[PDB]
Design a binder for this molecule. Sequence first.
Ligand SMILES: *[C@@]1(O)[C@@H](COP(=O)(O)OP(=O)(O)OP(=O)(O)O)O[C@@H](n2cnc3c(=O)[nH]c(N)nc32)[C@@H]1O
Ligand SMILES: [Mg+2]
Ligand SMILES: [Zn+2]
Lengths: 731, 125, 50, 422, 120, 54, 149, 248, 99
Amino acid sequence: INVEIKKIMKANEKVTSDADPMWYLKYLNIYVGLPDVEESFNVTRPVSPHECRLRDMTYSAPITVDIEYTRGSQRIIRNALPIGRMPIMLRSSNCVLTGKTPAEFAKLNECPLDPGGYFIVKGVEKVILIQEQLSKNRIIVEADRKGAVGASVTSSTHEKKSRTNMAVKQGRFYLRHNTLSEDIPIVIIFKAMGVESDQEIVQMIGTEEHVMAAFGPSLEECQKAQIFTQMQALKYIGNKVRRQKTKIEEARELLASTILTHVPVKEFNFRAKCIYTAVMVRRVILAQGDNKVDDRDYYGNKRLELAGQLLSLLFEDLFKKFNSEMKKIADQVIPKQRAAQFDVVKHMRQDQITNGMVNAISTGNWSLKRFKMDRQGVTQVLSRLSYISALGMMTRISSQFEKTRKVSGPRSLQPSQWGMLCPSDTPEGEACGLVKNLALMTHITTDMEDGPIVKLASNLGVEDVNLLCGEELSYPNVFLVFLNGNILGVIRDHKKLVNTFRLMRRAGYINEFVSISTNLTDRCVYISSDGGRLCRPYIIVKKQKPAVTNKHMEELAQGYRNFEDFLHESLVEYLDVNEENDCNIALYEHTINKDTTHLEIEPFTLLGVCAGLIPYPHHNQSPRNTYQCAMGKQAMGTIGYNQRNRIDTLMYLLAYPQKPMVKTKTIELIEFEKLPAGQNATVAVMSYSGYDIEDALVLNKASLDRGFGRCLVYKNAKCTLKRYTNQTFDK
Amino acid sequence: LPKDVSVAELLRELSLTKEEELLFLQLPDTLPGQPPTQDIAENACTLADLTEGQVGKLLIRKSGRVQLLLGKVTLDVTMGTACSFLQELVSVGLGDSRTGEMTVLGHVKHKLVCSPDFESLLDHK
Amino acid sequence: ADFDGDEMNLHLPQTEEAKAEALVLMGTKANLVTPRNGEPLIAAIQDFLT
Amino acid sequence: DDPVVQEIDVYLAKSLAEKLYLFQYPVRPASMTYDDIPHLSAKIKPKQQKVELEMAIDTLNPNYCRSKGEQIALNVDGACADETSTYSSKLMDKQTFCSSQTTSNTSRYAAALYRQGELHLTPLHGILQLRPSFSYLDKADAKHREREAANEAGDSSQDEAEDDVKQITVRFSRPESEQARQRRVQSYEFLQKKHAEEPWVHLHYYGLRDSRSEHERQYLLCPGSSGVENTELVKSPSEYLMMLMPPSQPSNVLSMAQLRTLPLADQIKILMKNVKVMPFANLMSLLGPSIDSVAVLRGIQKVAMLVQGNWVVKSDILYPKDSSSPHSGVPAEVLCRGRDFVMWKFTQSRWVVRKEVATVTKLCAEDVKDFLEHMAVVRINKGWEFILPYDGEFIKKHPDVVQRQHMLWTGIQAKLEKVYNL
Amino acid sequence: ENEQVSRSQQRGLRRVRDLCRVLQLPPTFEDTAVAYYQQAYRHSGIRAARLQKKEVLVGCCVLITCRQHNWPLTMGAICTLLYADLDVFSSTYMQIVKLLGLDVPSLCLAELVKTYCSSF
Amino acid sequence: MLLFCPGCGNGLIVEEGQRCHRFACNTCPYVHNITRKVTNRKYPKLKEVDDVLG
Amino acid sequence: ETLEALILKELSVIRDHAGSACLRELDKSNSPLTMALCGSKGSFINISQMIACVGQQAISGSRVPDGFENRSLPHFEKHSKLPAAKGFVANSFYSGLTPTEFFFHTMAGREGLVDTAVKTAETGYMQRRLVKSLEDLCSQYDLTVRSST
Amino acid sequence: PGTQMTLKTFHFAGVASMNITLGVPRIKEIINASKAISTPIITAQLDKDDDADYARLVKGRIEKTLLGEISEYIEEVFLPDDCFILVKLSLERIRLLRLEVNAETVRYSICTSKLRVKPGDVAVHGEAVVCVTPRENSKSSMYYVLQFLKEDLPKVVVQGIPEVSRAVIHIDEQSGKEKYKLLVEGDNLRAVMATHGVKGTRTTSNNTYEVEKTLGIEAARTTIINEIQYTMVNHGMSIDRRHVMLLS
Amino acid sequence: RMTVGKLIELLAGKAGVLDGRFHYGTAFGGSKVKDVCEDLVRHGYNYLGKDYVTSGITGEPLEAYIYFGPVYYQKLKHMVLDKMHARARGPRAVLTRQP
RNA sequence: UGCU
Ligand SMILES: *[C@@]1(O)[C@@H](COP(=O)(O)OP(=O)(O)OP(=O)(O)O)O[C@@H](n2cnc3c(=O)[nH]c(N)nc32)[C@@H]1O
Ligand SMILES: [Mg+2]
Ligand SMILES: [Zn+2]
């Protein structure tokens, strides 16, 4: 709501119609304002989230904008005009709950301990779960359906997303794209992309004897045909192009823009794309031998899209639709209406964006036609069974699979989930392994500018890929460097590069969230700066001694410094999955050896919120912990200090709730002791009367009479008395 | 062919033999200097702004360290990508607007890369 | 079953012939063994064996 | 590791700064060179550098197929047309090498000529990769197309005069939309036409074996003394770092660096609001030794009070006039009065009773607990004790400050006795 | 229904809905406005009328729907957003109210006061 | 092995001329007559003696 | 694979010896021991796991695979095939499990859970097909099993 | 029992290799009676079950052996007179593996479903030398087909059944005597029984379709019953044989 | 089920309610068994939780000691009053006349 | 969405 909405407005700032030139509609600045209610007669009034829940309305703010247009060639400007209503998230920057003391929360009828972060539409509380998908712009080498080891790459830019594959079904590399009638050999594409010398193609592919032996069939198949020039290759591609020299132009356009959109071309210069496809073919050849097949379940190649990105995409789509509708209305009204000059203000729909947002948040189905994205189950009703239930549901993660196949791969617990997601917290049932919860200590990165990163990489001696041929890619000491899937260049002695980059990041000249990883099997150094990556703080260890000391901890306890000071003083740093793949971490101080780079802050942070309630979980079994989390997601207890004024369709409360005697540090952090969901009872483990055969228990009549286990069930019955079209009303 | 190092390369080029050699070095984008009366701004300072004469020194310390003292700062020089294809250095001088002269100065065999010593630049202040 | 929240169904026949067939064929005393291998399934359980 | 030997000097040359190009052959190994291959001409352009070399190859050598040469010559050219022929004779004699541009800017690249005890650096005006181009095949394809057209026209022995008068098919110069105009501008044909619009320049080739090569090779050197102190290149490491990395543009939100970048008064105010208990020596150590002690004393005397040698932040600094109690909602004035009473009790006696403070101030248990925890700790069988010990060093060093704080505390005690009726 | 409707009546209905959505009136107000517009269109005198006549008919139907629920809305802003002049607006309003005879609740003073005070 | 034309760089195929077998290019008149024996061994991995199981 | 098998054999021998030692040192009247002897619930394997030492965490009949590059977790060295680095659990449930051992145990538990989840649907479909195919046969009075036709 | 089975692993039947699908997937494959099954197993007995030499001999006879797996080097030599491919057979490895394959057998194996190579193209010069000289077929093929030959020649079968992929020697160490048997991961029981030295009277196979096509419907029924019983016993659960008999 | 953690939690809770403290069950740490055993032996209770208990039905002591202690039990929303169902003839569906 |  602060930066992305402004960027979208700037991208779609100007809209104009083809007919009647010199007419335009220019957007200057968009505002969201404070949450207001349209109940009063054309009057705004501050409304509280509790009031919205009671009245079954939406907690949104009026979206306003200042615009300038030309009615009759005379420029007329508007300083404030509403265009829609954006549902405001609770405890946000513009929310009324933020910056409030518990006294003000009580005055506004809201619980101070409420996690917030959820939307209120039509009285129901909806939460946008975190979506987990595969990283874009990355080569994936894997077996095909029949078992053919091939490669795939899904190039996704801000406009289009195209997946192109490469197969070795008949010993030669055939490239497959959705815009081609039939898969064509890779050598023809090489010849079409400028590089026509077979010697240069082979040097780019590789100089190894096995590489040449494997690539020989492709050269033979290419030489069988009469394709030897760029013109002939482009003609062949155009002949193979599906309907949407003209064929040559279409083939060149597809090769430049459609195929491998993430690889940019300066001015029809396919050198970078040629190097990219050569590296892809080299990786395929290397994988065709030793079965070093990459796995999809490796979370180092996963991205988490928070509600912000989804809302940004939805707002962009809705704004584009509104601009198209306004342009159509202008084209239909201006030329044949009357001498009365037409202006947009008379047709500026103020309910389109509001209804779109309300439907997308309530129904949960998102259908973006501009991106061809049809998702379901994005929003879910916030479970108010207990405070623990709400806090655990707020930090859930849904997967892109959404119960397509019982693969058991993504459902299994991968070692990459260390410190990021709770291993034991998972719903028991059909959704086991697909719905996960974040760990107690973790973070999700955002998008950076990538400017200083490129500048530092260029200054650190990274040689331009266009300066040298592809033969240098086959050397053992020459390591490729990639930047968000794009080939940044080559480098030698990557140890110095990685050390200098890490030192600069610790100093602060580079954003601490930019991850750097090195894979020696492929000799590739990846520099990740996109958002959605999972990171975890770690204490830096140098020469068998951590940087953090007792003096620093005492200063933190007294208040001299904070976590930001620790980050700035090169004491604690954020590590990504790909970075910890290469870095060494120590669990405790006694485990620190000579080959250690980082130290674990706390081991108990591995568990999630729901698992943090388990007392001594390392003494129990994993299914026991899973069932305990599942039942704690339904445990009965108090919800908040406003549970009496809160009116829900179903609520369960406890008469005499008591905080646990054996409470965990996680419990103290989440303040669950203030809102417990159970009672401590003098339990005796024994067999009595044979009424506790299989997992059953025997209760005491006197204990139940004296108030033990007393529960209250609150149900809501709602009725509406609406007025119909005719002047009549229900009474 | 074992991978050579810059110190040994210079040693065998100067002591073992005396024949001149053409080298190609990649300097950083911005040099530690200011464009002398070039109408500015903290912009990039390349060799096109510097004048002739002594601009820096090449030092070779023990353990194989090769440094370049270009003023108050000291860069480090390392061996670049070992190019094996033909590289011919030529000067194309367009003395006349209608006819020019292409002069082959020599051949390029080795490549060097100069990088700032960011560790020293950080530990200095 | 394990007595940990299982919901089981109970049906009442509406015909004397159906009632007799259920009592005879589906009798608990007559179905003490499984047809798979003849092993008895209705026997002692935890808290009884001990 | 000291520079024992090899103290080579570096010189700079600007004679061939704009006339030095780097041509490299990705398909020709360094072993075989073009020194023995006779060149003919080279086509180049000043802007948008793209050089095309035209060389000559031998024919009498055993590594040439004369029959295939005749075949390719007859395919690319006509029988005896010879008006626009890619080869003078009926054999493939000329070879075409086309240049591809690596990067737009080559200022960071320089050629280093090494001599005995000195290294001369010369900037490069351009770097191009030379590869064997295939344009004779395209010309042969065009020739085949026109031959097929001629055959289709001459399908009959005698072709009658065709009445194919060109009707006036003058299409509209329709006003192209902005999107379509941008597409046309970005099309490859438009860029190729723009590149072709620039005229070519023909240049002769002078091999390395020629005397002109050694004559011009000396221009890479510069006349100058061995030791000359450069006027430029004298910036400090911090300035160089700032040049090579230019910038982009609870109450503890500000970090240590963001705190230090603020004035001394704001620094002291934020430190007091965060910690609320700190000795003067600790404050000096945190602020830095470069700041004057009198300045720090002046800064702290306005936002803190002296309690048993230690400094405690004032109540109004923690509780602004528009704030309120987060637990009870009482106004900030009552909280300030209670905190002042607590501080006065601590100054009078090191041991303070929570029950007595609550009974006197008429405040709630949570507020009293917060006030006591902000500046004290719990001791068994003794009540609440000040978190820091008695600092007599500062009291002995600054007696006038002690007297000022004593009179201020006397005034505060008078106000408290007037308000609470002690 | 929705098939024995002319393009002019459809354009009038769409204009009614567009103005209702611009003014951010509830769907009940939209339904009442379209119902009143259809009821007025039933008459032939309004059916075969001027373009400005039907535009003012849209405006007056919106005004009647707004008045029927005790909602304040100034005829000045209605004319401003309707592309019409006050003289013809009032003339056609009088003609249509005389032809129909629908209830015309008086504009409450307090509601208009509150609406105008929220403007400042 | 895989051989390339020094002139253009395209792949070379083995053909028979008027005097002896020679390597030749499909895009230029360049040829190369064979003087002595030329071999390209691959040393395929032999099948090891699968020992008894158990 | 030979090294993997030898390490697994050594870990199994250690587990069996620890279980035997625990069973020999435990005195009679012990509730878990009595329950395991009578067979009502539990067994010597579970007793040894919860008292003496937990067994090797086997995933798909093998040690914990290398999730990261050449190692299961970053806390261990690269190309390290040690028991504690590949899944061995030295400590028992009484003494408490280390973070890596607990993570491996959770991996095994989730693998078992997903296996059972797939098995439920697979066997349901198989049983439906089998019954729909075999629901026509019946035993006649002449001791001959005949179909519906 | 489908629910009772947990789909365990590591059940190599005592060989610590040759992963075979057992459990619910195996029961599904059996009840479906697919023509091609996953990991078929053929168990064959030996007339001389105590001689490891004869066991290896019959293993080599039944197992498919490619040319590249026995030849030590294959070189495409272009002599100034002609171009041809020379294959050198490793007689040492041949006699170590006890394979009855010589230059004549290799020559006979060549010219079989290989672009119709005439017998005159292949020749033998030494004891373990094979010279192949192809000719242009005029069907979009020229003398430069030596590359295709190099690609597809090493994968030519010289001895063994093409359907057989891997045959191993299993040993039973009964205290009375240690006997040997053949375990074949192929889909051809008829060839395995027809091979010399294999006691075809006691040969069993896992592929129900092959058993039916080879030994009859009754043999298929018996094989189905035995396989279902073995798969059920592997999980420790027992079923009355009457159920599987009725199913078969 | 190998739920030794439940026994440890019970022992820690008993020690805490005896000594007026709150023990911590932090994962991979927390209060050890030795500390709670020392607390129990100091307060006069058995160091293993098992205490001498007399049967309430027969009034005679039990041959084996019973393991008493405070455990944090939490009630779930699953209620038999809500899960109980009994369907008479009742209504049917319009399309297919079934319940 | 939860439950076995
Ligand atoms: C849940 O997140 C989604 C997922 O439901 P689906 O299984 O995708 O719905 P379906 O594919 O259409 O299943 P079916 O074909 O059997 O009808 O949907 C919500 N949800 C689905 N089903 C239920 C349900 O039965 N009860 C509740 N309370 N929610 C359901 C969930 O949000
Ligand atoms: Mg159950
Ligand atoms: Zn060639």
